[PDB]
Design a protein around this ligand. Sequence first.
Ligand SMILES: *[C@@H]1O[C@H](CO)[C@@H](O)[C@H](O)[C@H]1NC(C)=O
Ligand SMILES: *[C@@H]1O[C@H](CO)[C@@H](O)[C@H](O)[C@H]1NC(C)=O
Lengths: 435, 435
Amino acid sequence: ERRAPFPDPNDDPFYKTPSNIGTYANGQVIQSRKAPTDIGNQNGADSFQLSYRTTNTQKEAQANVATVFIPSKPASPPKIFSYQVYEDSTQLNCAPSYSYLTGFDEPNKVTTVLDTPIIISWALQQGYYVVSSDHEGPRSAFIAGYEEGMAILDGIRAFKNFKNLPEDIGVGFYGYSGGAHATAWAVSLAEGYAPEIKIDGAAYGGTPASAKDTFTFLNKGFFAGFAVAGVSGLALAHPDMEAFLEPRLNAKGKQVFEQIRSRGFCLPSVVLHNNFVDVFSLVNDTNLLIEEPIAGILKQETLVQAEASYTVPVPKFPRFMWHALPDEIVPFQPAANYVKEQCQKGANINWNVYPIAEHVTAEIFGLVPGLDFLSKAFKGQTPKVACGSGVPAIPGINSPSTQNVLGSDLANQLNSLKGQQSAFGKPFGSVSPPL
Amino acid sequence: ERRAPFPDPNDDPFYKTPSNIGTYANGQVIQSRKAPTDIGNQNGADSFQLSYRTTNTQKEAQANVATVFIPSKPASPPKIFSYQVYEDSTQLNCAPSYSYLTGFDEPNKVTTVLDTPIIISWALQQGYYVVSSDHEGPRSAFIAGYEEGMAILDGIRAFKNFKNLPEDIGVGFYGYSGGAHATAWAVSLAEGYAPEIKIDGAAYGGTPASAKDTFTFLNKGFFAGFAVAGVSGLALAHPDMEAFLEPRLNAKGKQVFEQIRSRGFCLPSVVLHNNFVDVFSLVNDTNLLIEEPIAGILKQETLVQAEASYTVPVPKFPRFMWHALPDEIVPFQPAANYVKEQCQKGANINWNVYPIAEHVTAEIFGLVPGLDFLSKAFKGQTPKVACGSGVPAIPGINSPSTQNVLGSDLANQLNSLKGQQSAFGKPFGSVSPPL
Ligand SMILES: *[C@@H]1O[C@H](CO)[C@@H](O)[C@H](O)[C@H]1NC(C)=O
Ligand SMILES: *[C@@H]1O[C@H](CO)[C@@H](O)[C@H](O)[C@H]1NC(C)=O
């Protein structure tokens, strides 16, 4: 029954990059302001907006905004929770920060309204400082991982200088669909860009490791419009790719793209549009991708080391990744292949694969677990798992009890075998592996 | 305080193959006898011995024995449980049937005494008819999968004709270490050899898919003696390989092998002997394996389709496989590679990987689960899992509860989102995936 508390981001100057941006240090806040949030209200938690220097893909000084929350009573020691919204849109109004603002009118508000309140409540009901950040930035480039990763790390650095937090503060990433993508890239970059950010863990699911693989799955699909949003975001991130594209737009394609960059064309829009359309149709040249610079930009826009024209980095810290096996929107496979690649390079990836789930459904399944996990990681207690797997069936911890299964006697007999010499010369164990 | 109730198997005629064996049908019992069993006693369950025609590797008519149990009160409908002992020995006294017999003296009795009572009790405390079978057979060939698989299927067919059971009776395999190997081969063969044996499921763990890979891991190891037992068993199974080997035995190797085929040289023996010895030392020719016929026999003695000089078959029915990741005795890797191979050919393999476990310890861990599972499979209720994975974190079913994680409110809010339109145009799901 109330309306937007703020000027639209294009109009608001806060969002505009300053002429002093080059002078401003990375992860340094140019300015800030209080900021009214439905979520921030539900949790009594002061919400703010931080206009902070960052870096774009071309390694250029640009400003950017994040939305931070401060729980009424912080955990000791202090912990930082980072949530990446699946904005999946190429326009500024679609920014998560605008979405966090109150009232029906904001376009991307729906993405914040569903799962996000539940999550950032919990993250605050546990005394973690929250940050969410406009991961596409002024460019508003969807699926542009390098740009998304730098901004999120800069936002945590900004969050830290704004609340004078401890550089050792342990941070906790979260994401799904496009937020997983933005996450997945922020960790991959985190070591190179922001080493001073301790990370107790990070959960994320429904993640597209490769933009090119995702686009191919999306193209000629109901979700093809997301691929058009993808192409447009990548083009905003890579301006030599824009130079390529602009001329090749047939009269249709010129309007497809100025529509998907138009005001109010956010996630809800982007889902209903360009359904079943071949992206290739809008471009004059059918191959499009093979011609440079998109092919080799796509070579850098992937975390799958098979395609990558660079050496994909490998997050060691304990991670938690899920994916609907039949993920009708984000290809399950390149996800698996990142995880596997990353497991032979030695990562701590509790991988959960839902066999009977959609993109939409699986967001909810591994929500509880991903947060349960995210709790433990902060306590330094991430259940120790074979990489690429989950916890295996441990009676009483995650499978039936030794007594419910065998009965009391047989379970007592099994509980005796402890310490006794196996048929192989070694002690037998306990039925519960080590915790 | 009592002694062996039976003549040693070499001496006992029951074990000897008849001259009428060719006339006898496969899985047809030549004869039988009551048979005293510690396990059979503990469970009030009548135990018998079945001398039954089967087939060896060279596709020849040979007799063989199995030990069957009949629970005091069978399940309705009737179900058959098959357990494969890890005899890991090349001598007849080492037979599981001799081990099942009462008294301290039998050599392989220890393998039956540890986990086996617990298991075959449970299998009987649940009203399943039990069969365990001398899977190495008269040849007593350890690690000879084709021979082991045919005998186990023949034993189930024999078990069935002996208790006039229903051909549709649903059978349930179990094994670990060498029993897993014998199992793993009995399923692989089951479709080709015994189609009429319905299988509601099969669990097994610590499984060596490839004899050659296992031997290499074993060689120059404390467990190298098992590799010598392996070579000797393969040689008994493949007599052109014996022809090869006999001459190449240096004076040491002649005595190593007649020792590992000597009476009373069973699993406990085989573990303490030939430790850290290079098998290659005993043979005159260092390569040994590369020269035919061992190389190409090893080409058939593997379930890993990469090596196999044949098209490895793929068990569809719901299976349950585990393996200690650091399995100091059985190489974890060829196990993984079977499972993965078998998952792209479309199998139902709930794969459990223990990250902090030994061969000896992991036998106990996935004992309860493997049986819990084995229960469900009989009820037709094997938890539906992404192949190569386990169940993924499902609150309240195998992970913390939606309320314990988020609290009551946040969990109620999550429980409302059901049926409501996601940010993608589709209903949200429930937090518990489908059961
Ligand atoms: C599309 O137009 C651009 C304009 O420079 C041209 O270079 C390109 O080759 C055209 N593609 C085709 C297939 O005609
Ligand atoms: C070992 O002895 C056999 C006996 O026939 C012979 O053929 C073989 O080549 C010998 N190997 C070596 C390395 O001398």
